[PDB]
Write a protein of this length. Structure first.
Lengths: 64, 67
DNA sequence: CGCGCG
DNA sequence: TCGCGCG
């Protein structure tokens, strides 16, 4: 199973599981926030833990 | 008969005076010299002053100068 | 405008 | 590549 330190990481993961790959502004807005900056530190931390991947060209995030 | 340049903020006048006497210098140096902590404390102001042609930045050294 | 950086 | 100025 994926290991989440904060429940909000699961919220991101499930959003991407449910809706396919999306940019950080979409993850943020879907979860009640505004911009990529509201979630990017979480996304890159999750990427470092092989929870998510990002396509560097489209900037879309997806589950790992 | 007013002095030149005119600065809209004390911060801008302080940056300009620091660079006139010491410059060029990196943003991290300017931030510390004005009692702040990192480049993030002055970058918004430096690029705004650059857009008004009050300062320039050397791309190679990253040091800011009075224009 | 990508920015992940405390 | 800590470059980053971004609201």
């Amino acid at each position: 199973s994926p290991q989440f330190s904060q429940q909000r990481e699961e919220d991101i993961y499930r959003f991407l599981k449910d809706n396919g790959p999306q940019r950080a502004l979409v993850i943020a807005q879907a979860l009640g926030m505004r911009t990529a900056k509201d979630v990017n530190r979480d996304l890159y931390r999750m990427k470092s833990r092989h929870l998510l991947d990002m396509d560097e060209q489209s900037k879309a995030w997806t589950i790992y």
